[PDB]
From a paper:
The SAM complex facilitates outer membrane β-barrel precursor protein folding and insertion into the outer membrane.
The first transmembrane α-helix of [name] is well defined, spanning the membrane adjacent to the [name] β-barrel, but making no contact with the β-barrel. On the cytosolic side of the membrane, [name] loops L1–L8 extend from the surface, positioning loops L4, L7, and L8 to interact with several N-terminal residues of [name]. Loop 7 contains a surface-exposed α-helix that sits parallel to the membrane, while L6 extends deep into the empty barrel. In both lipid and detergent, the [name] β-barrel adopts a kidney bean shape, with dimensions 50 by 40 Å. It is only partially closed at the interface, making no direct interactions between strands β1 and β16. The [name] semi-conserved asparagine on L6 forms two hydrogen bonds with β16; one with the C-terminal residue (L512) and another with S510, which is located after the glycine kink in β16.
Numbering used by the authors:
A (entry chain B): 47 to 73, 78 to 111, 127 to 324, 329 to 512
B (entry chain C): -34 to -23, 2 to 75, 105 to 178, 237 to 424
C (entry chain A): 26 to 128, 139 to 289, 292 to 333
Write the structure that this text describes.
């Protein structure tokens, strides 16, 4: 009947008129009325503009809803875990500019690898869906790359259209455009790192899918995860210095074993990835420039394949970790619970064993180019990707093993593992003792 | 270019401004002392005048500066002043040693007097402050010391036995200068008369200051006595009584600044020197003001440039107004977008 | 002890297998991709000096175009020797060690202590002609298309990155000219002059004209066709040639009748009695004896 919503002063009467005007079209089925009011109230909290302690729906006789708005300006600072050891971020948010919209200014100067990282992210919802958002970002970074000894200065702006669906899957569609200046070369830099040291553009367009059915992200005991990032740079209406097509499929899972609810949780995982060079312009047949070190994959590390350096497992020019074009990964786990403790503490005892491959792409077998030697046509690139995919499954992969002691914070996952490399390639730099892993994404 | 990085586009009884006396010398700059010496040798004292100034008191923004009253022209720099107001191996040697003294003896006096922060803070900065009017020596000697410390780079030396590096980098200049035979009419190399004034300016600012870290006066007095004899004899000949018989304007060396130093002019100089340090718009104020002063020096020369480009000042004002408007729009906020009570009725 | 199985290493990508796999040493310069296949002179004078010295020392090498960011120091001309293994290469040689790399029996004439008069005359080249090259290339709007072609258009193909790189180039060059005090030593604030408005570019021009006439007189003194009466050219000859060649190449126009201002190549060709254009032809005829493509 007659609905009153008190205490919402910095919200428009369009943003919360799209919500409660469908509700009043109900022209004695009291349960349907209460369920529709509860559905509208759960939709209203999907906008992140209200405090969870304010939602009081006090009926009469009809309806009378109350809310408490969040404050507008939120300055904040602290220490985040962006899969690194440390970070010192400052975070200024303006919570509700007109209705639903927000701005986030982030300034995270970190002494570890990213000495500066500036941000500005405006974000609106589209047509009153609280789950469909649209973001206009702008960045400026300078991040040290200590595996392949240089720095990368990234200035540009991207436009992301996220979408959370009704079944918990999250789509994404960004148009990025960067600068990617490579400089800051150490004296131990390789000739491969000196061959690519300068300016790029990389105007790209990348879809991201996620399907996260793990019951706990920081310590899975059941469920699965499917994630699929897929980029297209340079080809067609996009313009830049690089023009490629890069995909990546990551899987996961966990299966419980019996004794109660004892946390055994045999784990699993698999990553793949292929970087394909395309021509520039509206054609598929055409000469294609090979990839640069900005774009190639980096395998190995504490977060990625346990038992190796933070860049290992690939082509190495001297000591520098230059990248590959086709990779694979994967692991098994055991995650046994600790004795004299119930299956409720976040402490677990891991028994991992990973393996990985990271090969590059060359043009052997057809070398009649001579001069103008960098551009490669479609048949040469197709035979190169065929040979690299064949060189994945030719030989025992670069495998390691170990034990560990996982602690599962709500924002990160600390591991502290003792690894032991078993099978290597030459010049691949695996670590043999105690290794520390902090962050979210783990394999 | 934004027209501030290009050559300017053109349509289709002298008075020498200098610094002030210091260390018993008629000026504290090397190029100003050189220009004073050249005009004292060539011109007579009833032909020229000497005005005590700062780089914010002339439009050239470079203090050894001539104002020719016949044509109202503004000429800045020693080589420009001597290009105005005007066998082959002697001329080529004069050109070479002029280019050498300007380029390799200028960062050595800089290391002696401006980079060494026990020399600057105890000898150089009080002598700079004793010739400017009272609110000005808080803005101009930092800019002077910053420029001289920039020039003293490409030498690998600073203020921090690490004394043989100074001696080697000073021998690398004084060995070239010691073969010119400056105080001579015979023997050795021979240069023109104006190169001897430039050499006197640099070498007398090296030798004659009374400093607490005397690392350059002792190298000259120990290894190169001919240059010290040159400086002492040139100073005894051209400037007896310490540069007080020179034709300073309006009676004296300190009363020569009283024309262009009123309350309004000094206040404007200090205000503009303060406005250039504002963290965002102070670059574009400085670029717009420098372009304006260059335009008026060029119009004094005889040219007729195209002045209509104010995008530097408009760009600085746009950046400042953008930051201020963003801060007020996001901190003060907008008026509220809804009421407290918002009733929805069932439509009939 | 523990890695139980080690395989042969992974091959490098195709880009490094093409760019970094030569059998001669490689000098990384400022050139174009059609000039570097032949070995022609660079368009940067600080690279052409060392390239001329490495070609007078009878050293077998290649050139390849590079950017400043790849150098072991800040500035460009450096050398990378050939690989020994396909995945390992020796250390780079900066510009200060190039004549020490090249020994090619007796290179003592290219690396020798100059007399002090020669150092006063070398200050002419390193200041009065360097500032003239920088002012006339980077700040003159006539040479804007040449500046874009030589430095900005090979860097990327995006107009925003191109415009920003051209702005940083002009800012850096205007900083350089306003430090050396031919026509630039102004004091405006605590920050250095980085625009063309704090440069008097008639003093830069007149100092270039006097520098060229003094160097022509010094060359007339010598009477054995190279400086100071030598029988083979030295580092002074490569230092002067690195500016006189690029002035006759890229800065000899016909513009000179509507502005005054005889250009830099015509000032080189007219300095003295043509002592320096003849020296430029004699220095090309010794170090590049197969190239007949010069004078523009």
């Amino acid at each position: 009947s007659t609905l009153e919503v008190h205490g919402a002063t910095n919200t428009r009467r369009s943003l919360l008129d799209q919500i409660f005007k469908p509700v009043l079209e109900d022209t004695t089925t009291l349960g349907q009325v209460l369920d529709r009011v509860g559905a509208a109230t759960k939709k209203l909290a999907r906008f992140d503009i209200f405090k969870e302690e304010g939602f009081g729906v006090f009926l009469s006789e009809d309806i009378s809803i109350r809310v408490k708005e969040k404050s507008r300006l939120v300055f904040s600072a602290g220490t985040d875990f962006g899969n690194a050891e440390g970070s010192a971020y400052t975070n200024a948010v303006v919570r509700n500019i007109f209705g639903g919209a927000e701005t986030l200014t982030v300034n995270a100067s970190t002494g570890t690898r990213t000495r500066s990282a500036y941000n500005a992210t405006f974000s609106t919802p589209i047509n009153g869906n609280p789950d469909l958002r649209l973001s206009v970002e702008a960045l400026r970074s300078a991040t040290q790359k200590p595996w392949a000894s240089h720095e990368e200065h990234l200035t540009g702006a991207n436009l992301r259209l996220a979408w959370l669906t009704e079944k918990g899957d999250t789509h994404a569609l960004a148009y990025s455009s960067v600068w990617r200046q490579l400089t800051g070369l150490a004296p131990t830099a390789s000739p491969t790192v000196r061959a690519d040291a300068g300016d790029s553009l990389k105007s790209s367009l990348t879809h991201t899918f996620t399907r996260d059915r793990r019951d706990n992200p920081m310590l899975p005991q059941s469920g699965y995860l499917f994630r699929s990032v897929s980029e297209l740079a340079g080809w067609g209406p996009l313009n830049g210095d690089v023009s490629f097509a890069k995909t990546e499929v990551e899987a996961s899972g966990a299966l419980p074993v019996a004794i109660g609810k004892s946390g055994v949780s045999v784990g699993g995982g698999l990553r793949l990835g292929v970087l394909y060079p395309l021509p520039l312009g509206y054609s598929l047949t055409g000469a294609a420039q090979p990839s640069r070190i900005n774009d190639r994959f980096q395998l190995g590390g504490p977060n990625d394949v346990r038992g190796f350096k933070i860049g290992g497992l690939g082509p190495h020019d001297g000591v520098d970790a230059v990248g590959g074009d086709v990779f694979a990964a994967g692991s098994v786990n055991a995650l046994l619970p600790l004795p004299r403790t119930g299956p409720d503490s976040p402490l677990r005892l891991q028994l991992y064993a990973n393996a990985g491959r990271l090969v590059a792409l060359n043009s052997k077998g057809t070398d009649k180019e001579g001069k103008e030697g960098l551009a490669m046509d479609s048949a040469a690139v197709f035979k190169g990707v065929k040979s690299a995919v064949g060189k994945l499954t030719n030989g025992i992969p670069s495998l390691a093993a170990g034990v560990g002691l996982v602690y599962a914070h709500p924002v990160a996952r600390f591991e502290l593992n003792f690894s032991l490399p078993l099978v290597l390639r030459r010049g691949e730099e695996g670590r043999k003792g105690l290794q520390v892993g902090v962050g979210i994404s783990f394999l | 270019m934004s027209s501030a990085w290009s050559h300017p586009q053109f349509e289709k009884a002298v008075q020498l401004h200098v610094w002030g006396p210091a260390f018993g010398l008629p000026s504290i700059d090397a190029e100003c002392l050189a220009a004073i010496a050249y005009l004292a040798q060539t011109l007579g004292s009833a032909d020229y005048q000497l005005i005590q100034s700062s780089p914010s008191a002339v439009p050239t923004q470079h203090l050894p500066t001539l104002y020719d009253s016949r044509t109202s022209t503004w000429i800045g720099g020693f080589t420009s002043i001597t290009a105005h107001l005007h066998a082959a191996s002697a001329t080529a040697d004069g050109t070479a040693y002029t280019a050498f003294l300007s380029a390799h003896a200028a960062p050595l006096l800089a290391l002696s007097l401006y980079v060494s922060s026990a020399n600057y803070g105890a000898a150089t900065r009080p002598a700079y402050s004793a010739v400017l009017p009272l609110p000005l020596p808080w803005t101009e000697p930092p800019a002077v010391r910053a420029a001289m410390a920039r020039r003293a780079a490409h030498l690998g030396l600073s203020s921090l036995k690490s004394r043989i590096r100074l001696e080697e980098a000073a021998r690398e200049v004084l060995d070239v200068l010691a073969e010119v035979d400056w105080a001579a009419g015979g023997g050795g190399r021979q240069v023109a008369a104006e190169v001897r004034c430039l050499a006197f300016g640099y070498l007398a600012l090296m030798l004659l200051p009374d400093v607490p870290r005397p690392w350059l006066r002792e190298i000259m007095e120990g290894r190169y006595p001919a240059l010290c004899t040159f400086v002492r004899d040139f100073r005894a000949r051209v400037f007896p009584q310490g540069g007080k018989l020179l034709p300073w304007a309006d009676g004296g060396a300190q009363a020569s600044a009283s024309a262009s130093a009123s309350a309004s002019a000094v206040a404007l100089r200090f205000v503009r020197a303060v406005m250039a340090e504002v963290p965002l718009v102070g670059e574009w104020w400085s670029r717009w003001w420098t372009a304006r002063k260059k335009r008026e020096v060029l119009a004094s020369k005889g040219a007729k440039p195209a002045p209509s480009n104010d995008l530097l000042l408009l760009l600085g004002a746009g950046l400042g107004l953008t930051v201020v408007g963003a801060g007020v729009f996001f901190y003060r906020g907008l008026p509220p977008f809804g009421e407290a009570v918002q009733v929805w009725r069932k439509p009939v | 002890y523990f890695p139980l199985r080690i395989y042969e290493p992974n091959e490098l990508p195709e880009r490094s297998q093409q760019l970094t796999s030569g059998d001669l040493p490689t000098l990384y310069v400022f050139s174009t991709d059609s000039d570097a296949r032949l070995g022609l002179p660079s368009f940067n004078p600080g690279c052409l000096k060392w390239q001329t010295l490495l070609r007078l020392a009878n050293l077998d090498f290649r050139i390849l175009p590079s950017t400043n960011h790849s150098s072991p120091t800040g500035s460009l001309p450096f050398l990378l020797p050939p690989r020994t293994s396909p995945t390992a290469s020796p250390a780079p040689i900066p510009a200060s060690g190039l004549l020490s790399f090249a020994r090619d029996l007796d290179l003592g004439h290219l690396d020798a202590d100059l007399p002090p008069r020669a150092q006063a005359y070398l200050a002419l080249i390193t200041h009065s002609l360097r500032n003239a090259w920088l002012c006339a290339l980077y700040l003159d709007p006539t040479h804007d298309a040449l500046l874009r072609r030589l430095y900005v258009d090979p860097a990327s193909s995006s107009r925003a990155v191109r415009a920003a790189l051209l702005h940083q180039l002009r800012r850096a060059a205007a900083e350089q000219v306003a430090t050396a005090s031919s026509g630039g030593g102004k004091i405006v604030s605590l920050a250095p002059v980085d625009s063309a408005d704090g440069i008097d570019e008639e003093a830069v021009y007149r100092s270039a004209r006097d520098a060229l006439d003094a160097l022509a007189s010094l060359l007339r003194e010598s009477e054995t066709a190279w400086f100071f009466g030598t029988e083979r050219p030295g580092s002074f000859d490569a230092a002067l040639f690195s500016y006189t060649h690029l002035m006759v190449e890229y800065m000899s126009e016909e513009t000179e009748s509507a502005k005054g201002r005889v250009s830099l190549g015509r000032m080189v060709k007219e300095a003295g009695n043509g002592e320096l254009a003849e020296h430029r032809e004699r220095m090309l005829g010794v170090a590049w004896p197969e190239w007949d493509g010069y004078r523009r």
